[PDB]
């Protein structure tokens, strides 16, 4: 997208969201990142929403095909599952590449750095969901390491109700439960996060209260299912 203006790529990403054209949205936001400038809060959210939709569709498809393939055990189901898996891995590698070149290294504020490291944990987590080979343990550790650095910054630099801090803790708890086979760590993280947020709600405006309590409810929903 090298010939399109940065501002035009951002505008088109917003239009693509309205049109539910998420592959386009992701391509526009990739182009915007490759302009080399840091991203504002709104622009980071556009990048994240675009790729979460793209990879979300791939993950749903991979799960359908993996289920059919497990029940089957011709080559067609495995071949097609492998095709979808390779496309998913390609998208995760693209996002991880944007974070490494060069979003994270230029992110100095806690809000941007935590945001990108949470992304890095999520996309390694999506790689781990499909991994089976010599590097599967290394993929899991890469997710853990990214989430852990994000957690360390967020506890030092953000209030316990900050929505990015809350969503990071939610996703790290899912990592523990679903990927790392650590359900007790998942439950403890979700409970401690919820309780520390509850105790900080009194400091918030009405709008911030709504933002924080929405994610707190997601923490409670997981706790209900896990306990």
């Amino acid at each position: 997208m090298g010939s399109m203006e940065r501002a035009s790529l951002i505008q088109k990403a917003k239009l693509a969201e309205q049109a539910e054209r998420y592959e386009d949205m992701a391509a526009f936001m990739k182009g915007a990142v490759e302009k080399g400038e840091e991203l504002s809060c709104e622009e980071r959210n556009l990048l994240s929403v675009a790729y979460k939709n793209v990879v979300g569709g791939q993950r749903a498809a991979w799960r359908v095909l993996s289920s059919i393939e497990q029940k089957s055990n011709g080559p067609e189901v495995r071949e097609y599952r492998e095709k979808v898996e390779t496309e998913l891995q390609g998208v995760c590698d693209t996002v991880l590449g944007l974070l490494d070149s060069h979003l994270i290294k230029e992110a100095g504020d806690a809000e941007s750095r935590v945001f990108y490291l949470k992304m890095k944990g999520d996309y390694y987590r999506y790689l781990a969901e499909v991994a089976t080979g010599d590097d599967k343990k290394r993929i899991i550790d890469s997710a853990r390491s990214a989430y852990q650095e994000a957690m360390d910054i967020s506890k030092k630099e953000m209030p316990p109700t900050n929505p990015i801090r809350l969503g990071l803790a939610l996703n790290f708890s899912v990592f523990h439960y679903e990927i790392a086979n650590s359900p007790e760590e998942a439950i403890s993280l979700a409970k401690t996060t919820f309780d520390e947020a509850m105790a900080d709600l009194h400091t918030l405006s009405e709008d911030s209260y709504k933002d924080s309590t929405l994610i707190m409810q997601l923490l409670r929903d997981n706790l209900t299912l896990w306990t």
Binding site: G167, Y177, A186, L218, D221
Partner: peptide, 9 residues
Amino acid sequence: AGSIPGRRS
């Protein structure tokens, strides 16, 4: 177990 949906800006 639900992660952040994260699919609407």
